[PDB]
Amino acid sequence: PQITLWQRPLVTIKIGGQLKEALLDTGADDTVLEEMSLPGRWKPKMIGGIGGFIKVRQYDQILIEICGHKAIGTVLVGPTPVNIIGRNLLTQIGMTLNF
Amino acid sequence: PQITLWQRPLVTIKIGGQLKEALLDTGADDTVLEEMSLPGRWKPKMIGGIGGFIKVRQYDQILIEICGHKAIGTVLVGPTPVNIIGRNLLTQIGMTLNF
Ligand SMILES: COc1ccc(S(=O)(=O)N(CC(C)C)C[C@@H](O)[C@H](Cc2ccc(OCP(=O)(O)O)cc2)NC(=O)O[C@H]2CO[C@H]3OCC[C@H]32)cc1
C-alpha cells in the first residue's frame, strides 16, 4: 500500500491485544508510546525531542502489529504528544520513502 | 527513487542562498529549521513534541529546493535541535510512504 502525506500518517497498531492509533514517523529513530502496561522488565533510556530530553521505559522484543504487519522490537514508553512508530519498527515492516 | 529507513533520511536543501542538511520527517506537520534570517513577515508560534514546546517564527510562501524539486511552503524558524522537512513540503515533491 501507499500512504500520502496530505494528512498525518495515522495508523492503527495492536499491542498487548489492544488497538491504538499511532503516527508513522520517519523523523523518529525509536518507537515511543503513551503510558501503558507492558510485560517483563524495563531499562532506562534518555531520548531527545524538539523541546528537550525526557525519560522513558525501554521494553525489548515486544510484539506489535502496525497496519496488520507483525513486528517484534523495542518499544519506549513515556510522555509523548502521540504514539509514534520510529525507524526501528518502520524498517521491520519494509516501509520506505518514495518520490 | 526509493529511500531506505535503515538510517536517518537526511537530505540537502537550498533556502535563502544557504545549504542545510535536513530530515525528511513524515511525523512533522511543518518544516522547522534552526535560526536563520528569512525575508517577509512572520507570526510567532509555539510547536510541541517530545520534551515539550519551543517558540518559532512562522514564514509563509518560502521557496526551497529539495531533491531537485523547487517547492513552496511554510517554514518555522527556531531553536530546533535538527532541521526538519515536514509534510507541508514533502507533499509538494510527491513523497509517499510505501510498504
Ligand atoms: C507542527 O510542526 C511540527 C514539526 C515537528 C515536530 S516534532 O519534531 O516535535 N515531532 C513531531 C511528533 C514527534 C509529535 C517530529 C518527530 O519526527 C521528531 C523530530 C526530531 C526532533 C528532534 C531530534 O533531535 C533530537 P536530539 O538528537 O536529541 O537533539 C530529531 C528528530 N522526532 C522525535 O522526537 O524522535 C524521537 C524518537 O526517537 C528519537 O529519534 C530522534 C529524536 C527521538 C512537531 C511539530
Swiss-Prot record, chains A, B:
Residues 1-5, 49-55, 88-99 are annotated as: Dimerization of protease. The active site is at 25 (for protease activity). It comes from the Viruses. Residues 20-89 form the Peptidase A2 domain. Aspartyl protease that mediates proteolytic cleavages of Gag and Gag-Pol polyproteins during or shortly after the release of the virion from the plasma membrane. Cleavages take place as an ordered, step-wise cascade to yield mature proteins. This process is called maturation. Displays maximal activity during the budding process just prior to particle release from the cell. Also cleaves Nef and Vif, probably concomitantly with viral structural proteins on maturation of virus particles. Hydrolyzes host EIF4GI and PABP1 in order to shut off the capped cellular mRNA translation. Homodimer, whose active site consists of two apposed aspartic acid residues. This is Protease. The chain holds residues 501 to 599 of 1447 of the full protein.
